[PDB]
RNA sequence: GCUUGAGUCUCGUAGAGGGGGGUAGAAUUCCAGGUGUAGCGGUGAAAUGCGUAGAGAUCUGGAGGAAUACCGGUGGCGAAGGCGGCCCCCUGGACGAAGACUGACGCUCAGGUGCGAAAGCGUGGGGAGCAAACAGGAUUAGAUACCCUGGUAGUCCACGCCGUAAACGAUGUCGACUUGGAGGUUGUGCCCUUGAGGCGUGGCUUCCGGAGCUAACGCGUUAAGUCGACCGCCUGGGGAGUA
């Protein structure tokens, strides 16, 4: 699972590398792949938005089933896979009536295990069904905001919401930045957590590393002029400042969600 | 813990009180965790009781008269 | 007003104060009286007959309540959780009956390793 | 300092509480050994009946209600 | 096989509906080969305590003896039961007849 | 544990009838089968020290068997622990 | 060869022995609301603190974490550490009855290996109560203490690590023998359950005491008595369990 690596070189003196001797060994499912141009963090405009993104290995699209929108059919899992772009192990499920697809693999699923959607499912890991016919208390993953939309929670490593409380119509999901939650009762969440737990300790070791995995280096405020960060200048690291984001905004404390759109849903915001 | 203490009473009567816990566990739980005094004052207290034994045992004795 | 019926009457007792209330069926306060409220500040108020002060000035501003009959229920260890029922009495209630609820945990939270 | 588990073949049970209750209090907690006979084996297998039936709500914990 | 004894208390709605309930398990015991010996259903009683507030519940014991693949069955389905409030499940106990 | 069957089995299997109980050949072949089911219950739980311990006296003891059947008779120490597939 | 040591087996018994997983109730805290009011709290007395933004009190609902009131007992189990709600799963040992089987398979052990309270350490969760550090109040000649109000690590869970304690009956392990008394607990045989029984015998066990031993206190069939085998250890105090 989580080996170290032995110090031979600077830079793999702190690899720590996450291995998965179980997932698959070659190419993938061809179907259900396509390709995934990257985007440097350029919005159609051209310009960067989101800065230190761009570079880094190139990765095709591994079209994840998220809708689940096949009741009654069981599916048998054919065999887990490394997703790139992605947290999660995925796993190639195929279904009885010769169907393939994937699948957000959860915590103890294994190849050849059957998992199976619907209302009439069962409660085992990997089964998604309303959470209304889901027991309270039963820990769901890959939840559902609005209903048939496909899935937007706990889609991540290791990553579960629990559910507290249901009440009529509403299900309450305590989310995994401890913060509490509506949703309608019809939503679809697979039942359990996501499986490459240990996907937080791995250490990446170099600079390379980052550097391929897509990111860029972060040149700090104070290592810049006052022409390009509010932060910035001085005879010789002085900061003075109270600290901002590049474009002003104060950061290190400051609330910037304010939606007043989606806020009956939320019934305690993180802490 | 309960009595109804029907009002031809003119009585405390809450000898079930002070009978079977109130103070028994209360006043010496209020505080004080210490995780190995119970056994020592168990054994202190027990050696004691067997004392106790030990009086009734042999309490044959001339009264000085 | 609201010509409340009957009560309970509940004595949290101390160690250092002794809180008198009235309650009723549904349990609502109608008043309350305390025996560090009742002069008595500091080392006064830890004895019995403070604690029985206090159930008279309660007995007090429940007089417009008509509460006929009283189930007193205490609670705590301390000098009053009898003297406060005798002045409960001694004030004109019909103390129906003389319970308790006074809290026992059973082996839950460590407590205070207080008072060397 | 009877203990009816001289004559009570077919040893304590948790659904005979019309047995079990003269093992405990009026607050619903077990009685000792030493005030009421009840030879030690049976004394522990009655606790842990009285357990069961309190589990079952045979029994109550307390007399809070 | 082991001699389980199963207790089982059901909320009092059910209970106007819980044959049901006793039928289904004792078909899984049933085809699991196990064999019934007591089903010494005691009705709508009421509660000591309130528990899981709606008291006064309705008891049914059953007495079995069977493997853990049928007490697996029994006790997943008492969890994932909304009706039954609190079952429990024993050890050998020699399966016994009547005087509750 | 070794439940009555298989230590009936077993004492059938490796003792001179069903009377040989004791033999040393048995009592190696019970404390063998003994630990071999044992192992799968510790390689779980891998935590559980008491039985643990008693998972030593029981392979100790096997081995103190086993010597003194090797000092006694070469020839049956051999085959049983071909049989049973010790000491490889 | 042999069975008196040592084991194996058949039937059961008692148990906080162990690991894994569920679960219940009381209680402290927090959250939301209801009633209700100027006090709460704390102490030797106070004050910091909390309170008219409406607390403390009482009630209902919800969340979460730790430990399991009574049973409770020098009671039990375990090699020692240690282990106490209930239920389920995998598991070790002890011991009793009778009978059979092997036939010295034994005892003790340097080095080695393993387990080893609490604190503590790393990684990740969790965090109700308690609480080093810390801060404030008070005491005091001072008070970096006791005391009070708070409070972080920590105590909790998984996985590693440390490898120490007054880890102490300050009593190394195994075997034999040597007057007694009352107990506790767990087996079992016999006679009348003749009616809550009486007579034997196994195990573990607490206290008094005899011969003896001891410097004395004391130990006293569970020896510190009479011996046998193997091990560990000591050789004036401090320096020093330190360099």
Redesign the interface.
């Known amino acids: 699972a989580v080996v170290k690596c032995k110090p031979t070189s600077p830079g793999r003196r702190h690899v720590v590398k996450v291995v998965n001797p179980e997932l698959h060994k070659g190419k993938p499912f061809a179907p259900l792949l396509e390709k995934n141009s990257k985007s440097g963090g350029r919005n159609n405009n051209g310009r960067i938005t989101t800065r230190h993104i761009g570079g880094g290995h190139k990765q095709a699209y591994r079209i994840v089933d998220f809708k689940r929108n096949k009741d009654g059919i069981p599916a048998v899992v054919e065999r887990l896979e490394y997703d790139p772009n992605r947290s999660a192990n995925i796993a190639l499920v195929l279904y009885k009536d010769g169907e393939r697809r994937y699948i957000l693999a959860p915590k103890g699923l294994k190849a050849g295990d059957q998992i199976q959607s619907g209302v009439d499912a069962a409660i085992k890991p990997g089964n998604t069904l309303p959470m209304r016919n889901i027991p309270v208390g039963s820990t769901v993953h890959n939840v559902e905001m609005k209903p048939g939309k496909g899935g937007q929670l706990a889609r991540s490593a290791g990553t579960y919401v629990q559910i507290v409380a249901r009440d009529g119509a509403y299900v309450t999901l305590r989310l995994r930045s401890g913060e509490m939650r509506k949703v309608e009762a019809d939503c679809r969440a697979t039942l359990g957590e996501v499986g490459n737990a240990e996907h937080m300790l791995r250490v990446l070791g170099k600079a390379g590393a980052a550097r391929w995995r897509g990111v860029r280096p972060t040149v700090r405020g104070t290592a810049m002029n006052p022409v390009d960060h509010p932060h910035g200048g001085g005879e010789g690291r002085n900061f003075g400042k109270h600290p901002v984001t590049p474009w002003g905004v104060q950061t290190k404390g400051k609330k910037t969600r304010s939606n007043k759109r989606t806020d009956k849903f939320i019934v305690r915001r993180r802490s | 813990?309960?009595?109804?203490?029907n009002?031809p009473?003119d009585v405390?009567?809450?000898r079930?009180?002070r009978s079977?816990?109130?103070?028994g566990?209360?006043?010496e739980?209020?505080?004080?965790?210490?995780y190995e005094k119970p056994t020592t004052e168990r054994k202190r207290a027990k050696a004691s009781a067997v004392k106790r034994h030990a009086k009734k045992l042999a309490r044959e004795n001339a009264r000085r008269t | 007003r609201k010509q409340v019926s009957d009560g309970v009457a509940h004595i949290h007792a101390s160690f250092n104060n002794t809180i008198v209330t009235i309650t009723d069926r549904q349990g609502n306060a109608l008043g309350w009286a305390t025996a560090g409220g009742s002069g008595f500040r500091g080392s006064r108020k830890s004895t019995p007959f403070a604690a029985q002060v206090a159930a008279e000035r309660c007995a007090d501003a429940v007089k417009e309540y008509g509460i006929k009959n009283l189930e007193v229920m205490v609670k705590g260890p301390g000098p009053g959780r009898e003297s406060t029922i005798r002045a409960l009495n001694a004030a004109g209630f019909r103390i129906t009956n003389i319970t308790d609820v006074t809290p026992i945990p059973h082996n839950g939270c460590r407590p205070p390793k207080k008072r060397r | 300092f009877c203990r009816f588990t001289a004559e009570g073949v077919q040893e304590i049970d948790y659904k005979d509480i019309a047995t079990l209750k003269n093992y405990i209090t009026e607050s619903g907690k077990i009685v000792p050994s030493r005030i009421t006979g009840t030879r030690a084996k049976y004394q522990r297998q009655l606790a842990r009946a009285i357990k069961r039936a309190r589990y079952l709500s045979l029994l109550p914990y307390t007399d809070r209600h | 096989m082991r001699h389980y004894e199963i207790v089982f208390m059901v909320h009092p709605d059910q209970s106007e509906q819980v044959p049901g309930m006793i039928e289904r398990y004792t078909a899984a015991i049933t085809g699991a080969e196990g064999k019934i010996h007591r089903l010494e259903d005691w009705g709508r009683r009421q509660l000591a305590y309130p528990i899981n507030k709606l008291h006064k519940a309705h008891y049914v014991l059953m007495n079995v003896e069977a493997p853990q693949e049928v007490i697996d069955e029994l006790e997943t389905t008492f969890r994932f039961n909304d009706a039954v409030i609190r079952s429990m499940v024993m050890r050998t106990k020699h399966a016994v007849t009547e005087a509750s | 544990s070794l439940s009555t069957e298989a230590t009936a089995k077993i004492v059938s299997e490796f003792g001179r009838d069903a009377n040989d109980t004791g033999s040393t050949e048995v009592q190696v072949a019970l404390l063998t089968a003994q630990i071999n089911h044992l192992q799968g219950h510790f390689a779980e739980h891998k935590k559980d020290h008491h039985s643990r311990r008693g998972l030593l006296r029981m392979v100790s003891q096997r081995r103190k068997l086993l010597d003194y059947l090797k000092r006694k008779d070469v020839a049956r120490y051999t085959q049983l622990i071909e049989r049973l597939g010790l000491r490889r």
């Open positions: 813990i309960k009595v109804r203490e009002e009473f405390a009567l809450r079930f009180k079977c816990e109130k103070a566990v209360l006043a739980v209020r505080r004080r965790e210490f």
